[PDB]
């Protein structure tokens, strides 16, 4: 199947004496696998998935040195941006980066990503050609010209087509068992008189992994598309997730309605109803 | 392994 790797990096400047805080998080198939945080007593890249314990001390030492470089890069970049936008000192500012690759099951690079945001707004991005830049505003035009003049895109292209792909392959090989694990939802329906002769039926799904899930309500064999309220899928805090979906129905008709739960972990979708 | 950025912004 398809696979992805991403590194999500954040530098945040602080008005006081302190240098910017720098955090980098690595993900494989959307699962956090390494993290570096300049605020730790011993800042270093740390494994965040059990399958990363295979890497030797030199992996961690050299990645840590890389992070240290990135941290200086972001400090300089933040200073430059403050000048581009004519911002006053003694504020706080956020620079973010996302980088990585999506691969097919034949290990072909499908797309490479390299993009930045400043103050939560898109700043500059490497286009899908891995050769040209899209710059969002006036300041980013300065950065784009600078990067075109130094031939920056070819270094990012080499990373995205080379190292990104090859390391992703290594990680997927090492983390195979673990990355395929699933926990199935347990589901049940609750009944809540809100009223004017109406009831809310709420269909709960609990304890499931990964977070991807679909809950639907139906009446007489049609899904209820518009009428249904949802909550965003939320972490239980033990590694599993939770979600619910509810419909408003007439009192006396509750038994007509069925909730369905679709999840990768299940041998088939669940189907359930208010059981008084 | 992580990207190593080149020229600063």
């Amino acid at each position: 199947g398809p696979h992805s790797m991403r590194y999500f990096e954040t530098a945040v400047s602080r008005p006081g004496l302190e240098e910017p805080r720098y955090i980098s998080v690595g993900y494989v198939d959307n699962k956090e696998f390494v993290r570096f945080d300049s605020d730790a007593e011993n800042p270093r890249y740390e494994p965040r998935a059990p399958w990363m314990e295979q890497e030797g001390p030199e992996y961690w030492e050299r990645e840590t040195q890389k992070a240290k470089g990135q941290e200086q890069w972001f400090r300089v970049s933040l200073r430059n941006l403050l000048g581009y936008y004519n911002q006053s000192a003694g504020g706080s500012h956020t620079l973010q980066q996302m980088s990585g690759c999506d691969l097919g099951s034949d290990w072909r690079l499908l797309r490479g990503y390299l993009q930045f945001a400043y103050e939560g707004r898109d700043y500059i991005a490497l286009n899908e050609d891995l050769k040209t830049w899209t710059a969002a505003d006036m300041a980013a035009q300065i950065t784009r010209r600078k990067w075109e003049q130094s031939g920056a895109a070819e270094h990012y292209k080499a990373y995205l087509e080379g190292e990104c792909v090859e390391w992703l392959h290594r990680y997927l090989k090492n983390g195979n068992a673990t990355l395929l694990r699933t926990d199935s939802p347990k589901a049940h329906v609750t009944h809540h008189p809100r009223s004017k002769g109406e009831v809310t039926l709420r269909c709960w799904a609990l304890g499931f992994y990964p977070a991807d899930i679909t809950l639907t309500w139906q009446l007489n064999g049609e899904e209820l598309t518009q009428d249904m309220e949802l909550v965003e899928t939320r972490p239980a805090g033990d590694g599993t997730f939770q979600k619910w979906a509810s419909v408003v129905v007439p009192l006396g008709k509750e038994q007509n309605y069925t909730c369905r739960v679709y999840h990768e972990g299940l041998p088939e979708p669940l189907t359930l109803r208010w059981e008084p | 392994k992580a990207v190593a950025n080149f020229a600063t912004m």
Partner: T-cell receptor
Amino acid sequence: QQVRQSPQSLTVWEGGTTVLTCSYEDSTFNYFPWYQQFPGEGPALLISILSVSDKKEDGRFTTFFNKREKKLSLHIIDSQPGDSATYFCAALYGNEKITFGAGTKLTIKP
Amino acid sequence: AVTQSPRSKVAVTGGKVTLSCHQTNNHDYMYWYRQDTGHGLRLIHYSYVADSTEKGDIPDGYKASRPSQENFSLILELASLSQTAVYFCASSDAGGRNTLYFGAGTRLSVLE
């Protein structure tokens, strides 16, 4: 040490092709710049190549990279008196600090 | 530009020597290298920000100072004979793969 550059000096006849070579130890190195230094001046970047490529050409200068043998080379065709200089190969990985070779002193004589 | 001062220095053994470098590249990284009879660029010290410095490969006998973004000095508190060499300053953006821009060198002779 990590970048081995030999010999210390080399003379090639004017018009001939100069071949300079270096080897490296760390197989993860992936950026390879050559610096050229004239007498009484500092080194200046001549040509560079990433490990994704086999060669890079710029005028009479070509650098070749061979990952399998961990060898870098610089070729100068139609070698001229103005090419007389010290050539440094260098290598690094990622954003780590550059490692320079010891330099080869080139003299083009008629 | 990266410009070093002085161009040449003759000093007594045990005497104090300061080599200066001024860069107008708006670069953040600065470096001091040693070259010996035309060979090597061996890193002595470097710096990535005003007010601090970092040891290079061969820091023994030398100190470094970074009093501003533009200036980076190399200090020999007690010059020895063995420090007779040519010294080159450089700057770069953010180090790593960023091109190094060098000064034209300072020749130092240390004599009894």
